[PDB]
Amino acid sequence: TESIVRFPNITNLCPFHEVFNATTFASVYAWNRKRISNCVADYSVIYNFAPFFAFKCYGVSPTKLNDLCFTNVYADSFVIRGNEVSQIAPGQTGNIADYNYKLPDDFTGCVIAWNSNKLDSKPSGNYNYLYRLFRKSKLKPFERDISTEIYQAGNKPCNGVAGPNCYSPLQSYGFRPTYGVGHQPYRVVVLSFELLHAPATVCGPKKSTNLVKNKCVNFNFNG
Amino acid sequence: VQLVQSGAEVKKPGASVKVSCKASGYTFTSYYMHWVRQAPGQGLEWMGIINPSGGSTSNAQKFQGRVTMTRDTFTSTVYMELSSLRSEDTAVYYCARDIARGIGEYYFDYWGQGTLVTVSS
Amino acid sequence: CVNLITRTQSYTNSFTRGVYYPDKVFRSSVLHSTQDLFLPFFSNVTWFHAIHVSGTNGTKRFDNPALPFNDGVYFASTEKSNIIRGWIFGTTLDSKTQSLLIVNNATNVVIKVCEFQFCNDPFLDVYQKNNKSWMESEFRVYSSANNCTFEYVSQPFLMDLEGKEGNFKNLREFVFKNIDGYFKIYSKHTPINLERDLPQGFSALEPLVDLPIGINITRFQTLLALHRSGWTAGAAAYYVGYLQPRTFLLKYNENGTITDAVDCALDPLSETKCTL
């Protein structure tokens, strides 16, 4: 007969003005994790931002995205070298997957990546954004590793000296305009979703229709 | 907060010595006050506690009863005493203060000044 | 900050406690078999009894407060009139990392996760200002208040000792569980009679706050409240347990309440009732 979509009464838009068009994304080894809670999702501004080189949503579909919701999400920020833009996909190994950032094997979120080279780069070159070149083992999913212990690449115990067989775990790219568009620095935003076990809190401004029972319902009640 | 001890002191073997340390810069009664030893060029050793609030006068089992430390709040000084010294110790003595208001944990700082009690035939 | 509180030791058997609602459901007359973090039945739970003296005869005692935070804890105090006032869950209790500062004065709870300068013995000083001058607390717990996130400023956590009818009042039980970037705190205040040590009874617990913050918490220690006169002779009754990953069968009652449970592992008898 009728459909009920009774949702919480609130209008505070979820933080996105400080997520995408932020000042400067952190480096891949120091990635941000901005928890989002107690608001209403407004994924329209994401498409309003720019046409994205990658938008692969591994949990749900982008059209399906705007009208469903979960408990609380996380937005992670990156700027990465152009080769590894696809490496954010769940399950892979490279300079960044096993050393800097790896999505869980059952990732259920979204991945966004677009140009910033003409936007945020320097003709003389920027070294602010780093990357974890070396690490002892694979980096567990959703882990923020920050230490800068010198890798033991030689028989001699390095113990922090800088020299042969002593390589610092942290290195940086060039970020020059004189780079091919296929490998130039790329910003990344990753969104993470849960499986709706806890009550939902944050989603799109779906109009909360009236409640009518005893006849028939397309009940939603946040799931 | 600087401390001060007595000057160099010398005794013959088999005699007594009575060293003193004066506290300054803080509340004398609140903080503990320890005593330590080390033979010239050798490792350190720790005597005991003279907590000024009430005479605790502790000591290790090695010096048990041999060392009789006494407090003095009015002069904000600490008095530390020996008995029957025959060339055994002849070491440098430091009055020690620990980093704790009230009940103490034996982490030392502000190691007094340093006195060389000397015993030899 | 001052270091004055000393702690004694004891052990006792938590007969059967710690069962709590894993999630909000109206499951009625349902024999659910939820597997989660719980307190093992008849486990050996410590009996920390922190004791303070006005201060005299320091008698060389070293301090010795220290507590781990393996999985979750079962702080289950019994003390009558509020002295246990909050906990300082953290990982280093220094200016390096984050740490919660749950503090429960007479009218609010002041969860203020923040990089704090917790020294070796935190405690709340309630000092008398005038002849009456109400009551005022201060800070010897922390001295830094560094870069950090927001507070939680909710309704008081522990109740205000509703003890008119003359009994030995609520067995205040909390289960602080940290998982997947959340802080889950449960509560229950079942009253008891004069002489009790958590008797039999499968009484359940209810979630109180689900803190969104996520930290590497690995140590904690409870904050006492010392009535300044040097301070008066304080006392407390800790009941720090330690949770373990166990499989429980919960016997939900008619009104959605939980009244019975079984750990499935204490005895082959319990396992057989767990597999039905």
Place this chain on the structure above:
Amino acid sequence: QSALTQTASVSGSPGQSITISCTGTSSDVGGYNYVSWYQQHPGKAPKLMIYDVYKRPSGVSNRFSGSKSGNTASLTISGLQAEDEADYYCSSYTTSSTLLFGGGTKLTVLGQ
């Protein structure tokens, strides 16, 4: 007693990060979680450098980091400059009601 005995002497180079060890009765370090690493500048009174296992006091330049596993303790000095030739001493509260001081670690650095 002097149960806590450490390395007699250790050597290093400017810039290198050498760790010195504290060894003694495993009850003393295993039972209680208190260690201390007072420095000893030759010719004058010693002073503290890290009062707990990994808790530095004021004025130590955050150059020394502690560790502990059963009967282990270290400072992990960052640079090992020429001024760090000073003697180093370990200490820990005991299972018994006493305090034991280690003896040794006359650290040396290049320059002779």
